[PDB]
Design a protein around this ligand. Structure first.
Ligand code: MYA
Ligand code: A1BHP
Ligand code: CL
Ligand code: CL
Length: 426
């Protein structure tokens, strides 16, 4: 029984709609609460100054997440996002100062809560829109189970709506309301001895450390040439590469892709916003296609698909005309090994966006796995989004624990396969 989520414009688990459709759940451009939400006495909101990596706010945020953010099931690993990562992930083109929200104890100046939104452009079927991604919701462990989280969620909702944005995308490792897709975690072991020492895997009875090393080795043969790190001057080419990829896997006609309904222009009117509703005759119309994905202009490409040591790795393949034809990318997050004083962290790569045109996706990932090994990553993690199952199948990836639930706030999306989703959250 929910007490907060049952009041929100999201599809509920008990929803009994017998039709597949798309569109906003509600069009309420001026009826939302505009007054700041009250925090418990002694606590105050503040806009978190992540615009200078040396600021005190950035140290406070880094420390809060380091000790209190997402942990695995058994509380053996906790994410340890670096400050350079958080800057790359949160100070994105178009970001607003007030979408990085902290909660501080007034007497001690201790930061005890955080929630963030980043602006992104997304296509959802026949619509395109400026939207938000909510991430890094975090409450101090000593303040949990006191119903603070709905306060932080309502407050970021208010701050997003003040920017005339009424939808959001977010993920969760547990079921809340009805998710529009469910992602499966997959792990590729790179550094066996480190992951054994960390307790992530163990040594099977029918194996040895040496046979494990042998089994999990990244294949060294069949190397395809032409790959190099991306640079800023690649941005226009990379932008075109992404447009052609999303055009290839579209779930709407060519004319539709070229004339997407821009919800930003009609979300101010209950009558005009109705144009965004779209009934789907057959669910099979979407099979093998991408239905929802982020859209990147040249400025976004320059920011996201770059190379920052220990944060983000982007390589492109060139042909004999020196034209970019393929791309792989992954970001890098350390995790704390909670109960290991002498081996306190591991370095994990996470697949981001990958486009294979001149090679198979399996060959592309093999080149990416080698590069992640050479970037000192102990494992390579992926979701079964987009065409990744092609590589996950008949590979040495091992399934993870739990599932990643995808949600859209104030939009209707039929339950779809993760192959239909091109949205990666940090
Ligand atoms: C138009 C714009 C819209 C913008 C907003 C879009 C929505 C954004 C939504 C957020 C996007 C998250 C994206 C990410 O960052 S996902 C990762 C979230 N962060 C962590 O897991 C870090 C460690 N954990 C914690 O810090 C706390 O446990 C948190 C802060 C998560 C909850 O603290 P606490 O454990 O002290 O709980 P409570 O007593 O205060 O409150 C209980 C209520 O909160 C609901 N709850 C609990 N966890 C989540 C969750 N992860 N998403 C959504 N709802 C959640 C729960 O169902 C219940 O409601 P109801 O079941 O009674 O109804
Ligand atoms: C090799 C190794 C050692 S520890 C480790 N993962 C943890 O500890 C851990 C703990 C909690 C949640 C997790 N989700 C994932 C993950 C795994 C694969 C693909 C995406 C993933 N997520 C990352 C975060 N954003 C959304 C997508 N991993 C964890 N992997
Ligand atoms: Cl209030
Ligand atoms: Cl679920």
């Amino acid at each position: 029984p929910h007490k907060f989520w049952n009041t929100q414009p999201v599809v509920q688990n008990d929803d009994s709609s017998s039709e597949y459709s798309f569109g906003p759940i509600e069009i309420e451009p001026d009826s939302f609460r505009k007054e700041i939400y009250k925090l418990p006495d002694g606590f105050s909101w503040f806009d978190c100054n992540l615009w200078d990596i040396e600021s005190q706010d950035f140290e406070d945020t880094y420390q809060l997440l380091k000790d209190h953010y997402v942990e695995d099931d058994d509380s053996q690993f906790r994410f340890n996002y670096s400050k350079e990562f958080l800057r790359w992930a949160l100070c994105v083109p178009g970001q607003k100062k007030n979408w990085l929200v902290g909660v501080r104890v007034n007497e001690t100046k201790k930061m005890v809560g955080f929630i963030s939104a980043i602006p992104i452009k997304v296509r959802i079927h026949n619509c395109i829109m400026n939207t938000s991604v909510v991430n890094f919701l975090c409450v101090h462990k000593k303040l949990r189970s006191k119903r603070l989280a709905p306060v932080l969620i309502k407050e970021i909702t208010r701050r997003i709506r003040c920017e005339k944005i009424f939808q959001s995308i977010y993920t969760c490792g547990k079921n809340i309301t009805k998710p529009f897709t469910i992602g499966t975690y997959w792990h590729r072991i790179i550094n066996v001895k480190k992951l054994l020492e960390a307790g992530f895997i163990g040594i099977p009875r029918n194996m040895t450390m040496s046979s494990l090393i042998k089994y999990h080795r990244i294949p060294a043969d069949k190397r395809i040439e032409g790959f190099r790190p991306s640079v800023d001057s690649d941005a226009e080419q990379i932008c075109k590469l992404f447009e052609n990829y999303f055009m290839k896997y579209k779930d709407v006609s060519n004319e539709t892709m070229n004339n997407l309904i821009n919800y930003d222009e009609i979300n101010h009117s209950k009558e005009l916003g109705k144009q965004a509703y779209m009934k789907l005759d057959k669910i099979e119309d979407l099979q093998d296609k991408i239905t929802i994905h982020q859209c990147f202009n040249v400025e976004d490409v320059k920011h996201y698909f770059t190379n920052i040591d220990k944060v983000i790795v982007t390589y492109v393949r060139e042909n004999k005309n020196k034209e970019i034809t393929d791309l792989f990318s992954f970001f890098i997050i350390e995790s704390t090994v909670i109960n290991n004083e002498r081996f306190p962290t591991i370095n994990i790569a996470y697949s981001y966006f990958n486009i294979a045109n001149t090679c198979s996706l399996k060959e592309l990932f093999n080149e990416m796995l080698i590069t992640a090994k050479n970037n000192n990553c102990d494992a390579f993690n992926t979701l079964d989004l987009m065409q990744n199952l092609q590589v996950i199948q008949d590979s040495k990836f091992i399934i993870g624990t739990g599932r990643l639930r995808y949600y859209v706030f104030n939009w209707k999306i039929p339950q779809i396969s993760p192959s239909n989703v091109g949205i990666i959250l940090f």
